[PDB]
Design a protein around this ligand. Sequence first.
Ligand code: EOL
Ligand code: EOL
Ligand code: EOL
Ligand code: EOL
Lengths: 381, 381, 381, 381
Amino acid sequence: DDYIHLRKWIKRIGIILRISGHWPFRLPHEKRNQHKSKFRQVYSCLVITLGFITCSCYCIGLCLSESIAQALNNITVTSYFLQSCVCYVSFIINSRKLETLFNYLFENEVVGCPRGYKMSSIKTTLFRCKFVAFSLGILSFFGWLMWTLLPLAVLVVDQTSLRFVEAWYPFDTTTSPMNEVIAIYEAVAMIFLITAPMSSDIMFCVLMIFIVEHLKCLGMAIECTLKGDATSLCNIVDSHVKIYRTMEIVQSVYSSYFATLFFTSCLAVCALAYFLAATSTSFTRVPGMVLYLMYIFLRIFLLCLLATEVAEQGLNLCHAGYSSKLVLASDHVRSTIQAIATRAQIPLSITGARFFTVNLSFLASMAGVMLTYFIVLLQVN
Amino acid sequence: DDYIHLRKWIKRIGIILRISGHWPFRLPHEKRNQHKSKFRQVYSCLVITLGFITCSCYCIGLCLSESIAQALNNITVTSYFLQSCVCYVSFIINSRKLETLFNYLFENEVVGCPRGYKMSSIKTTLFRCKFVAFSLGILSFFGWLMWTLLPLAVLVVDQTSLRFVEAWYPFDTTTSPMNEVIAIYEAVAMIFLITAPMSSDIMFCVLMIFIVEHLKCLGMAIECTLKGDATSLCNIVDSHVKIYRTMEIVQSVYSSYFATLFFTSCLAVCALAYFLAATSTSFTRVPGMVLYLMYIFLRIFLLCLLATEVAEQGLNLCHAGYSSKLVLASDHVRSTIQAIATRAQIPLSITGARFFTVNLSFLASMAGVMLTYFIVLLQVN
Amino acid sequence: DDYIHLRKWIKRIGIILRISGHWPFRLPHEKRNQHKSKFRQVYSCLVITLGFITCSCYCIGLCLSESIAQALNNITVTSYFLQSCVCYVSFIINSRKLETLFNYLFENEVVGCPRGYKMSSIKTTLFRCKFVAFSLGILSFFGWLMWTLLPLAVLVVDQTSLRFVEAWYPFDTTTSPMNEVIAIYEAVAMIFLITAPMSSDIMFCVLMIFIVEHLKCLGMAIECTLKGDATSLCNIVDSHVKIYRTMEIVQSVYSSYFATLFFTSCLAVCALAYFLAATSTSFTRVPGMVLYLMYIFLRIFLLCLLATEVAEQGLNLCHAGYSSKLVLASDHVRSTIQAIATRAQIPLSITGARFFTVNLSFLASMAGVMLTYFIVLLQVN
Amino acid sequence: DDYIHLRKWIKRIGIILRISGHWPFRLPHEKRNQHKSKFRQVYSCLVITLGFITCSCYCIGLCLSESIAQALNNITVTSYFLQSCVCYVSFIINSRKLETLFNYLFENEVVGCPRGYKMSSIKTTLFRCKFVAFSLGILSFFGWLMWTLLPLAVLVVDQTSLRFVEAWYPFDTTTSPMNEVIAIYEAVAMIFLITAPMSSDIMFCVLMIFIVEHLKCLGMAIECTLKGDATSLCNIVDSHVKIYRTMEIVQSVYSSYFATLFFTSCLAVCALAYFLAATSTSFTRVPGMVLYLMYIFLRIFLLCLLATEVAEQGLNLCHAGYSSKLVLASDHVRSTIQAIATRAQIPLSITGARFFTVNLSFLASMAGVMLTYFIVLLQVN
Ligand SMILES: C=CCc1ccc(O)c(OC)c1
Ligand SMILES: C=CCc1ccc(O)c(OC)c1
Ligand SMILES: C=CCc1ccc(O)c(OC)c1
Ligand SMILES: C=CCc1ccc(O)c(OC)c1
């Protein structure tokens, strides 16, 4: 059937998680322990130290800021680069729980639900997975292409300023050949520094989609069980517990990464809005800044939506198996459904380092914070 | 009895939902499939494309705003017009769930409650339905009458400016006959563009009133059941489940429409307060602006009140059938009432695209946001 | 014993509720229907129409405000006077539920609790009742005395300005005898206009203290029942239901009154802080303004504290009868205690017209709002 | 084993609680009533009256502030000193509940958990206890050393201003020997005034760590009980009740102390940020101000983290003993686990005088308040 398709996609995500330079863990379809090969183990470490030296250069470039304009110009790139740095460290540390996470979305067969629901669930999962992957991929590729190779293409068609923001360097980088080779190094570094948080967010969104479909199939399984004693209820409770444990495993790495992401993204959005609204931009950097805003807004909105859907499906699992059949069932079923409802009243939520809950109302509150601190940066001039 | 009266009113709402130009669905009292007649199917589509061309004209009129005054003058009408546009699209898409919604408030007989309560419930439902319909109808009619036909009447009694705000047009519309025919076209377009969200909000308020009366009759049915085994409890649980499913059906269309409504209404209120407080208005537009504020405040307050009443009645259904009889009942009743209370602890709330819950505290928070952004528009001058 | 003392105090509150001019209802100790005597029925109506004409004079005095200073000077007195007006109307309308409220705190004997706890409960109730009554009484009397009879005493010891803020009048009230007779009329009107909300708030605080002691005795009764089957649990459930119904009766009148009180009190606090911090006060009105702030802060803090204590005692009633005895009890007790805990998880809260919950965190949020709008009034100058 | 180690540390905390001058209560390892000896009873009272006279001097130094700069300079030290004053009073009053608190963390053996978990729990408890104690100790010692003995060392190496902020005194303290002896008295007073809230916060953090480990061992005990009837469940319920009562005992003293701490700490942080960002500091006080900020931020973050961990462990105790075994257990176990889950749904939270809940989101909200009132102090200049 089409199920063989889904594994194919959870192959490709693993492959792209090896492309960006994350630490190579064992994916499901490796029975010869090729994740410990020295080739990938030096490739990942080389990309990681390239990432660290580039992020450190752009970070110490921020501390040597004379005016507020150079600081606000370094804020955006330093924001995204330390986001990718936190993502690199958080995926290096927990290279064991990612094994369990990729073992979850490889076999997840819910026992009890009808097949006519399961096929439509697999179709919806495939469609939403492809949409979420391709949208961020296309937007990120076009944003990198503009932001890095538009002023270089302008100069190769035609006091240069090929790069957007300046950073600390050993040499002067004002003389002609140095600026070109630094621009090329910035291009390859920004490839390997952009594609890591996009890959992590694609994996998070795939996890959330699979968990939403698991919860819907669990609700249908409870209904089809109640429509008809022990074994179906035990399998339902076990699948509910597996969903809760998988969300608890998802919580930690993305808690640290989400705290860093949301704070630094709010700073980057405020700085970009100030540069677009106030200063005299030279029309070459504007296709970079108008796509970087769209990428950031799309990323925040998709993360908040696929985090809200899981809590909504849990609270809808609270209202499962509640009819005249429940009043006419035995005491065993009437106690087990009560236990399931009591445990399902607890919400499955992702917290960003326990400072906030990733919901859709949090996006509105953060948009209010952005709009409050945008007027301040406008009035400071 | 008087029950034949209530169906009459749920006839008229359907009729007014065909007047404003919504897509014709099958109401309860049609057994010959006359909702698929070509007459209404071209009437609705014609009013809809008139609405879209007028809203698009007023929307591209906003983007060609030189000063901040013309932008803030276009904000109010563009706000209301894109509200009506979102309402038109959301009622075109879900023309199947409106069938179920009109099937709900056509037969809703609760089994178990005494008749002496049911007659008073029908009287209260009729009174509050007539009040909510007639108040918005009278205020909207007087607001349209002032806002559109006061400066035209001033000119026909007596460098013209017959319309309030300017919009993009192919011609110049400054020469005399063009401005009059554009004013007449604006009059008929503003009729068909005002009466659609008012009709949708009347239908929402009728739904909320009927659901509140359903919940009160369910509480009385639980009390009269406990005062006296299987069949009454099964009918109670089934009616509770029907109420929850009907609220879940109400949630989606009004979620999208409420997000658009509340955001654009906050913008319109802030702009109107700035124009009334600061600038030198020429005393002809002031009867339009002082009625548009009253309509917006009345609409927001009635929506928030009839959304809060349902949650309050659900949490009061939690405290139903709790006396010394519950302690002296069997284990079947003591488990079924416990299941009803556990399911009733979940609140029945309407969310606006999951960004906020439509409550009465949200009206206070939005009034705080309005008061915060009114002082900013005053200080910007 | 000392219980005969408590009834004495719930006599006196009723007497003071007849002094301020509220509509005379039947208190507990009247078996000859003397609350329908014509003497009190004309006394209350006369004080009420005096209140309405004075509040209307001070309210139309606000609309004829040229500068912002006269408006901000009328804001405080118009605030308190329309607070008392809303209190007068809300106590005229619900003159039937006050019968039930005074029937509650006249006999409230909890069955099951030990006597050694009940005597200490009555001592604590008497002490806190006397403290809450006498504090507001002394502060209100000294505030009225300063605010009304300090500039009159200054003039009778010694271009006059005997009253603090001016109001609309038929005559000019600038000539000498008119200003003195208007000051005397203002004195007696401010007596009858100050003592009504203070009396209502004393009655609310007495209700909250009695309900807190009822909840504590209910918790001790549950513990002493579980330490030892049917009758004790039935009496416990009945007393819990009586507490919930009494709080539901308290909710409505104080909901409307609390919405008016909290909004108008926030306005009055902001205006008083602006007048004390910025302008050149002539040192005679300062003992009025420094006592009016203390009265308002004391009133808000005591209302919020005695509203928070009830919710805390309910959530502590959730943790009642939970030991190794519950694990060793029968299924009847293990189901009834579960039902009591499930119903006790619902909080007993007082909402101000459903816009906010009267808690102690709401006092902090309102203090933040006051501090935000105080800086604005300072910067406007 | 290593358990003998843990008692050693709960000796030392008691010893440091006698060093700072708190009222001497009976610790666990005193069987001869040496806490009522006259030596410690005069030592504690002498340090307390020294604390009160120093805090009163620095408090009346604040009221004689001409400019806003001297007031904002006195705000920080008066903040910390009245924090220590509230801590002294709150530990003098409740010298009886501290007996119960030190009796809790002396024997807390959970019955049912495996030993392999308990040894790792004791190791984690020892490590986190040593970390939390030593971090605050080292930072506080270096902060006192800089803030008090840096300008004195500068003068003894070399119109003086040896102390940071001035306070009221009987003499002039401008002449040379008076300023030196006042600086020495300030040194010893700031030792005895700094080490008391640090000691109280160390005791609070030790309590929170022990309670978190107790809750984790309780969850493991529930799992190991369900894996296998009466006695294990009774011991589990008794340990849960002991945890709830111990948190209720912790609530009161730290409620008053936390309200004072959080408010005065927000004021001190805002004032320090204004002095570091705006004015021309003379480079000697900057090592005091940059360490005082780090101490305050570390204290607030550790208190909020170890208050959030307990609520998270309680809500994780809600999901305890929920598998296919629960569906296959008897009605006794299926009712007792349901009662445990219903009681565990209530959160174990520490409230600061019931105005706010000490969580990690409250730290974010208070950081927002700090950032809001820092810009105001910058713009006031
Ligand atoms: C300099 C920040 C990296 C970056 C630049 C432009 C973008 O569009 C983008 O989104 C992927 C990322
Ligand atoms: C231009 C906005 C349409 C409009 C104008 C005036 C109103 O009173 C109104 O309420 C129905 C709507
Ligand atoms: C003019 C407002 C009435 C009023 C004045 C002063 C007060 O102290 C007061 O508290 C009872 C009330
Ligand atoms: C004057 C306030 C006392 C104080 C000063 C500096 C510090 O570092 C500190 O933390 C313990 C406390």
